[PDB]
Amino acid sequence: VVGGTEAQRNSWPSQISLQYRSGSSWAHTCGGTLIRQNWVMTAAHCVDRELTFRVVVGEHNLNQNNGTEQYVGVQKIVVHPYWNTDDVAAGYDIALLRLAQSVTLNSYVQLGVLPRAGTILANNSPCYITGWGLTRTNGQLAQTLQQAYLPTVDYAICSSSSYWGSTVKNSMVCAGGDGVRSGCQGDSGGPLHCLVNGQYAVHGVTSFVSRLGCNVTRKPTVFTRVSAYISWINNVIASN
Numbered sequence: 001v002v003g004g005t006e007a008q009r010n011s012w013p014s015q016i017s018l019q020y021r022s023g024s025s026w027a028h029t030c031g032g033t034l035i036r037q038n039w040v041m042t043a044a045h046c047v048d049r050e051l052t053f054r055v056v057v058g059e060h061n062l063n064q065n066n067g068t069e070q071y072v073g074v075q076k077i078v079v080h081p082y083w084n085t086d087d088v089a090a091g092y093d094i095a096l097l098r099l100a101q102s103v104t105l106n107s108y109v110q111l112g113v114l115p116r117a118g119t120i121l122a123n124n125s126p127c128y129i130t131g132w133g134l135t136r137t138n139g140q141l142a143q144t145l146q147q148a149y150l151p152t153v154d155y156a157i158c159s160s161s162s163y164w165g166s167t168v169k170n171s172m173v174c175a176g177g178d179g180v181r182s183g184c185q186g187d188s189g190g191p192l193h194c195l196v197n198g199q200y201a202v203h204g205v206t207s208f209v210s211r212l213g214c215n216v217t218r219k220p221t222v223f224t225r226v227s228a229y230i231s232w233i234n235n236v237i238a239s240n
């Protein structure tokens with residue numbers, strides 16, 4: 001997250017850290033959202049490579065013990081059937097991870113609230129992006145969970161030639177683009193939390209930013225629109 005601020009420890013309890021094993025140690029690679037005690041929602045491009053993955057819930061500071069973390073391996077990976085790693089602009093950047101064990105819910109670990117199917121947000125709706133991603137283009141990961149206010153940019157405006165144009169589809173949600181705040185490498189797969197009916201719900205899965213850089217004027221961070229995948233998500237969890 002570029003242009004963000006440290007979030008109050010565990011103020012976004014459904015946020016998870018997706019890590020892979022590198023030799024004898026682990027490394028953060030993506031964010032994710034806990035949607036069931038044993039299911040995590042993240043981006044398909046986060047699991048393109050065949051490595052060993054693990055999920056950490058109740059995390060805040062990646063480098064030290066907070067006394068609230070729970071570590072669990074990934075037992076099954078279900079990527080959307082239409083995902084094409086060579087065409088992220090085509091969409092379908094969403095994957096579901098079945099955890100090897102069910103995590104314990106508590107003050108630091110809670111399930112994320114998903115929107116109703118088909119729900120589209122009005123322009124400039126209040127939302128927040130959270131993650132441990134780069135805090136600057138070509139920079140380095142944040143040690144502590146970061147958050148940034150990132151209001152939405154509706155499809156009409158986002159798909160105009162003045163922004164992303166044809167690159168963005170209705171199956172995506174755009175947010176930010178103020179040139180100061182944005183998601184960045186490492187935030188991928190993470191949530192876009194938006195206030196709806198007095199309640200924060202996860203409306204997006206961080207997917208991509210401009211090739212030119214993370215925080216670019218008129219190049220909002222693009223997210224997979226979760227509300228377009230409710231049926232698929234429900235069919236997978238009630239089958240696996």
Ligand SMILES: [Ca+2]
Pocket residue numbers: 059060061062063064065066069
């Ligand atoms: Ca920690």
